Amino acid sequence: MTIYKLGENAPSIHESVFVADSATIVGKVVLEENASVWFGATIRGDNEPITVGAGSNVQEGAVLHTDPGCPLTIAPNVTVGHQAMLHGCTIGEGSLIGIQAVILNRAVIGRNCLVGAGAVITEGKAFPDNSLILGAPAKVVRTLSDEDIARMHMNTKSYAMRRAYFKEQLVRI
């Protein structure tokens, strides 16, 4: 596997976590219960700590990094889509980060936000809870409905389930 200890800092991974063999986890990284990191994703905890909250998933090729003074915190029940890039930011509980979305240092995404695929959130930007954030540079286009939020959570919960399926039914050929 690609789980690495850097210096004296070794990842803290809950047993229930699914970490794909090609998912790189380095240094100061905390992966909470029911979280999952997929193929090709990389979580490099060499500067500030990086936390992936319980029930949260980090999909294929997503890259999580930080810079000094910019810890990366992903709250519980969050989906980080394929190829996304989170850099030293804060993601609120229940949010969904779209495919290839880019979020830079100091950015703060509130609870239940949906960041659109291909969006780019610049450094220091803050967004209120339940916001649909689209564009590059991204901005709040409107508030999400109960349905939007419920579908986002359904996807995230589905991944928390898929996690167990991959842990017990995935066999190399």
Next chain:
Amino acid sequence: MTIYKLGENAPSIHESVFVADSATIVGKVVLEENASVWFGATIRGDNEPITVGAGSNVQEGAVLHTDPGCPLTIAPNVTVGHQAMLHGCTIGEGSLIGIQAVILNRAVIGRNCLVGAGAVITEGKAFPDNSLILGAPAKVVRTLSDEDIARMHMNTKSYAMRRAYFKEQLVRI
């Protein structure tokens, strides 16, 4: 290698296929004759089936996935560029998907289309044959010329050839 069987579903790969050691193939995936999947690419067939048509290539870091009710079908002679992301869509024969392009569920790209680098095709969008599709959200900017189409195909055919070269002349150091 990173070829995985998920549950009872194992990938169907034609012997002529080139699958890079770091290319992840999981579950319900069909890779037809002369297709090729490069380093870091991931094809996750855990929901709907994913088919890569004969003579088609999936370049470095591209990620192919689907959601229930949204199978991913890549027709023959198609090029999927580096870092692209295809999610539950349909790609017509002879097309070219640009670098980092993103195509979401239910999108349908006709035959001989060229999707520009960095474009974003939203869910459900459909585009006619021979279209040059650019933007995010992407749209048809104009019809491609015989030359445009011929150059696209030349690239794809070149990859079908490069496939054999890598299968027999690539040696780990």
Next chain:
Amino acid sequence: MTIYKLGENAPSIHESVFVADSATIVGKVVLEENASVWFGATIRGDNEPITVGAGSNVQEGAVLHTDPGCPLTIAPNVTVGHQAMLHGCTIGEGSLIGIQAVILNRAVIGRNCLVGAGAVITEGKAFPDNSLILGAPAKVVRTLSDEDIARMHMNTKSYAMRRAYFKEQLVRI
């Protein structure tokens, strides 16, 4: 590791280089002193040669490729950010390529340029030294200040240092 010889062409890597185990280096590739290639990055030297200048870094998931007649040359002291894609272009000394930025064939980036995250530089575009290049298609928005340039270099130099730390303190778990 993922260092590959293609045909008769084998990578030329300076001993001081840090090459992550999952970093793919193939064929005609030259990695100069103090350069570093991170997890999931791929440098495919199967067409034209690809050179990574001394003290330059190629971050997670970045993909470097070329096409015939389009060599890829990355000058010394350059930072290529996470998930960037450089295709047959020329990057001037002291520059910084932002996260997920895409630069296509024949593009020329002068010395000390900063390409913004998510930008897309089309084929053949040329940009003068000390330019802040943003957008897709990207363009020069303004000249960088001494500070901007100095901070860019600080990041790149920091990576040249981090390189040694990973070479001696990174241990698989």
